[PDB]
Amino acid sequence: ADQLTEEQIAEFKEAFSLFDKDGDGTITTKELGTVMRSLGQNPTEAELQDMINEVDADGNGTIDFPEFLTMMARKMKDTDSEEEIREAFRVFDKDGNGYISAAELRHVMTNLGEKLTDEEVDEMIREADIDGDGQVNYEEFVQMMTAK
């Protein structure tokens, strides 16, 4: 219906839980490392720590539920506004051909946790295909995030 004060929080609580594989309220280098290793990549022990050290505003070395609600608000400034969309795209376009297919999306799905069924995944891409090409392109992935 309409993004309310709870619908939003629930969304972040899910992402904060996806990383907390165990669910102790603290993302470690191994946990986030497992997620970065499942999507189909290989995080570096040094970069990883430096990555979890960015949101870690406390200086402890672990991310927390509150640090989350406060991390998505510190990147929407300028050093990560239009570059974050191109990254999310890469995840979908693993092959990097210039388009996304329900298959590439199905892969990312199980890589984060939920795995949308088929008809849904098929319709999810059909609604974005403003041109009707059977797949999603870069313009769409952006035209949907630029028009508010």
């Binding site: 992402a15 570096t44 970069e47 990560d80 974050e84 949308l116 609604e127 949907m144």
Partner: peptide, 26 residues
């Protein structure tokens, strides 16, 4: 060249995994 997906990034693709729609309000 790139340098691994940043933080808000991994949250971008996961947030996309909502239900059957596309695009994030953020």
């Amino acid at each position: 060249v790139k340098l691994i997906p940043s933080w808000t990034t991994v949250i971008l693709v996961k947030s996309m995994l909502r239900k059957r729609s596309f695009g994030n309000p953020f």
